[PDB]
Ligand binder design. Structure first.
Ligand code: OV8
Ligand code: MG
Ligand code: ZN
Length: 844
């Protein structure tokens, strides 16, 4: 055994020992209990970043821990290969997106294997291969004939200079983010998942997830946005029916979730596309411009509530069906056409958004709810204005005194008796649009025939192979400029027909890949029925918070779709969900000659502790703020150079010890040094132990007769084993478990283990400490364990807790004052010469 810890020699050898033993290549074996630990598969973007290392080390600690406890552990790995980054690099470096992708995969695979992750590489998938996306094209055709997938005209943003579609997040003040040209709203036919048909199922099944973060379940409930309200119809006054047709000339219909406050409606609001808005804007140019500004907007829903609410009066009036008040109709920019009826009622006294709107335009406010004896200020909003559980109605005629639920049913009675309203349930959830005007994506298995219509590709002709021999230029999606691809024959009549040139949303690949890992080479379906029954569902899911809404909801939607098709037997894909925090770093720059800043990568800097300067230039730079690692402010720390400088075990240990997994991790140069020096200490601790006698049989059994010092070390040992096991399986806080093993080595250093019984307790401490640290630093623990014990580490198993070593030794004693029944005198005074051991006597 070498005296000094050199990871470059022990990490490759330990990896071959694991690959030769094939301990990570697991099977559907009904002998050992299964465990499915899954980390979110990455985009093959070129190199791994620190966010990748943290996410996949967390998954590996959980996997190696469950494996050491006797589980059949599947930790698969794959690549989310479809996406825009491949097209952008294709335009930049003049290469094919497929070629650019496959070289990033084979390089990032070498980085992952160097870190020593226990990954079953015989289950590796790649979403850009036809052997994978053929099955989401297959599920597309099935759900398309059922109507779950349907084709419908939709509105998108078209950049007339970059010649492509842009999402709302890529539009800035009406212009494209790159071209800077005004975008055009276009109505094009697209495809949709009918996810609204599963809204009640996706909402209620969140209650089954007793091991999900409560905030993730909360965010999904708000996104679905179920609401039980009331449809209300306000009759249009006779002086306002000009230019209206159909039922719009008879009434204005709205939806509200608080019909108990219908007596407090001071005005109504309609969307810019509403017929009442169109009839009012016929001769007033101020309304025409307001409608045009609303249509030209591109507010993303992540910022929809943060936009300034604006409105214009129409001069038209409707009648409240309960008190007969004439309410003026306004055109509001926050009312979205297609969300319900496209028209709402406003109660400024009990809705904060209506309060700020009325305060802006000096609109009336009518209090109709009261909570206790609280004062109602018409010029200041209070939190109790919108309370529902502890309020009673006021200023509502024959509705005064009713609470929320009784007034709700009372209002429904009057509305239904008049035929002016009825209860209705609504959902904020929209359908899922999957059409993408991109090249590097899964083709949509639709063929357009002038006689048969939109025809799905039959199952025999799947997949519709995307040609990998394309280099996009940037002047339109290449699939539309390639007749050799879209010119085809109709699979129904054989006539001339064209293929769909739009590709699928890349979220479709990530929505079911966790099932494909169970049988990645299965060629007769999405997932083999035998492997789906064995693995069931993912036991542990690890990923970032940015996928808590869209990706997680899509994965649950696909799981219920595949369940209703007969492929799987679970309602939910993920049992446990761990949300890893981001990784941040310090930013550096220099001042530009034009009044700006040019950012510098931290690796190209060196600090004096005081100021900082370049590594080779000696030009003093300026240190800036700390934020998430990104190429924006050029603060990304390459983990490969970290592996080159310290090895894989130091990188894994630093990220597991710097902060808890949910908390953000700040990069620290001195932090990775403390991780490396601790691994040097652990190596020296085992070396110096074997240097004075060698290995012995670790202590086991009855500990009676051991010294007080050695008994205290065994107590600390089995306390650490119980503390680490609870930190891995339950708390999932890996930084606290590292310090627990560190404190065990502290007491070991302070304990004389030179005796014959001392050597045995020392062996028991070290054999457990290397197994307690194996999930975090498997390379050095594998090497050190083979020096202490000759058995295979994974067959020795997770350290067992000896509960006898935790029980303290008691000394029963009798206490008689004056004959009748230093620490013993203290307890016998909490009840004077004492005979040592059995008698204490209180000199009365
Ligand atoms: C299931 C799919 C939708 C996953 C998708 N292919 C994806 O997000 N792929 S990815 O390659 O983008 O991320 C792979 C995984 O591991 C890294 C995590 C951290 C990302 C944020 N971050 C970055 C830093 C410092 N550079 N600190 N935090 C990430 O959330 C994810 O869990
Ligand atoms: Mg349960
Ligand atoms: Zn046809």
């Amino acid at each position: 055994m070498q005296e000094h810890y050199q990871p470059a020699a022990i990490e490759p050898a330990a990896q071959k020992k694991w690959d030769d033993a094939r301990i990570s290549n697991v099977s559907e074996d009904a002998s050992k209990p299964k465990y499915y630990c899954l980390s979110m598969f990455p985009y093959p973007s070129g190199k791994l970043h620190m966010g990748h290392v943290r996410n996949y080390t967390i998954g590996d600690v959980l996997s190696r821990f469950k494996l050491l406890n006797g589980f059949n552990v599947m930790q698969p790995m794959g690549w989310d290969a479809f996406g825009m980054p491949a097209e952008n690099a294709a335009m930049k470096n003049n290469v094919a997106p497929a070629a650019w992708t496959y070289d990033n995969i084979e390089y990032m695979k070498t980085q992952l294997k160097s870190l020593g992750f226990a990954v079953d590489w015989e289950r590796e998938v790649a979403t850009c291969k036809p052997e994978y996306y053929r099955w989401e094209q297959w599920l597309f055709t099935k759900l398309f004939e059922k109507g779950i997938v349907y084709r419908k005209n939709g509105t998108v943003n078209w950049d007339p200079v970059d010649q492509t579609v842009l999402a709302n997040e890529q539009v800035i003040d009406g212009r494209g983010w790159r071209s800077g040209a005004l975008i055009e709203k276009r109505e094009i036919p697209m495809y949709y998942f009918k996810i609204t048909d599963y809204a009640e199922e996706l909402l209620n099944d969140l209650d089954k997830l007793e091991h999900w973060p409560e905030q993730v379940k909360t965010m999904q409930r708000n996104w679905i946005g179920k609401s039980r309200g009331m449809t209300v119809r306000f009759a249009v006054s006779d002086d306002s029916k000009q230019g209206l047709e159909g039922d719009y000339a008879k009434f204005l219909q709205v939806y509200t979730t608080r019909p108990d406050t219908l007596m407090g409606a001071t005005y109504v609001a309609v969307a810019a596309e509403h017929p009442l808005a169109t009839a009012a804007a016929a001769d007033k140019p101020e309304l025409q411009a307001f409608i045009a500004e609303c249509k030209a907007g591109s507010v993303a829903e992540a910022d929809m509530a943060t936009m300034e609410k604006k409105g214009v009066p129409t001069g038209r009036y409707v009648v409240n069906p309960l008190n007969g008040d004439k309410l003026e109709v306004w055109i509001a920019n926050y009312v979205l056409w297609g969300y319900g009826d496209g028209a709402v009622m406003a109660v400024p006294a009990h809705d904060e958004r209506d309060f700020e709107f009325a305060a802006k335009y000096n609109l009336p406010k009518k209090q109709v709810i009261a909570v206790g004896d609280n004062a109602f200020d018409a010029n200041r909003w209070q939190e109790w204005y919108g309370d529902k559980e502890n309020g009673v109605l006021v200023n509502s005629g024959d509705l005064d005194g009713l609470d929320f639920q009784t007034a709700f049913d009372a209002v429904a009675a009057k509305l239904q008796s008049q035929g002016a309203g009825e209860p209705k349930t609504q959902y904020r959830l929209r359908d899922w649009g999957i059409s993408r005007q991109r090249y590097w994506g899964c083709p949509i298995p639709i063929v357009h025939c002038e006689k048969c219509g939109n025809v799905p590709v039959p199952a025999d002709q799947l997949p519709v192979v995307l040609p990998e021999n394309v280099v996009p230029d940037g002047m339109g999606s290449p699939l539309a400029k390639m007749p050799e691809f879209y010119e085809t024959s109709c699979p129904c009549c054989g006539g001339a027909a064209k293929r769909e040139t739009d590709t699928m949303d890349t979220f479709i690949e990530s929505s079911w890949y966790f099932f494909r890992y169970m049988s990645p080479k299965f060629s007769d379906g999405m997932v083999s029925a035998e492997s789906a029954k064995y693995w069931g569902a993912v036991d542990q899911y690890i990923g970032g918070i940015e996928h808590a809404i869209l990706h997680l909801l899509y994965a649950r939607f696909f799981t219920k779709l595949m369940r209703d098709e007969g492929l799987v037997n679970v309602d939910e894909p993920f049992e446990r969900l761990l949300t890893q925090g981001m990784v941040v770093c310090e930013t550096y720059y220099r001042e530009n000659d034009k009044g700006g800043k040019d950012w510098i990568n931290p690796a190209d800097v060196e600090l004096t502790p005081v100021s900082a300067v370049l590594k080779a230039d000696g030009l003093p730079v300026v240190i800036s703020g700390t934020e998430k690692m990104s190429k924006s402010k050029n603060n990304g720390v390459d983990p490969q150079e970290l592996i080159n400088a310290y090895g894989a075990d130091t990188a894994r240990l630093f990220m597991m010890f710097a902060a808890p997994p949910e908390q953000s991790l700040e990069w620290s140069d001195s932090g990775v040094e403390g991780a490396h020096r601790f691994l040097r200490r652990l190596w020296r601790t085992v070396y110096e132990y074997l240097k004075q006698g060698g290995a012995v049989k670790a202590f086991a059994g009855n500990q009676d007769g051991l010294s007080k010092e050695l008994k205290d070390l065994r107590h600390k040992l089995h306390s650490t084993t119980a503390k680490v096991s609870d930190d891995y399986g339950r708390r999932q806080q890996f930084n606290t478990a590292i310090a627990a093993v560190m404190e065990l080595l502290n007491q070991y250093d302070k304990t004389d283990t030179g005796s014959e019984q001392g050597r045995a307790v020392a062996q028991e401490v070290l054999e457990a400490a290397v197994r307690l640290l194996w999930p975090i630093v498997p390379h050095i623990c594998e090497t050190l364990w083979s020096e202490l014990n000759g058995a295979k580490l994974w067959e020795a198993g997770w350290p067992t807790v000896d509960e006898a070593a935790l029980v303290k030794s008691e000394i029963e004693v009798m206490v008689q004052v004056n004959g009748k029944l230093a620490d013993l005198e203290a307890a016998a005074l909490a009840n004077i010469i004492v005979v040592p051991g059995r008698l204490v006597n209180i000199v009365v």
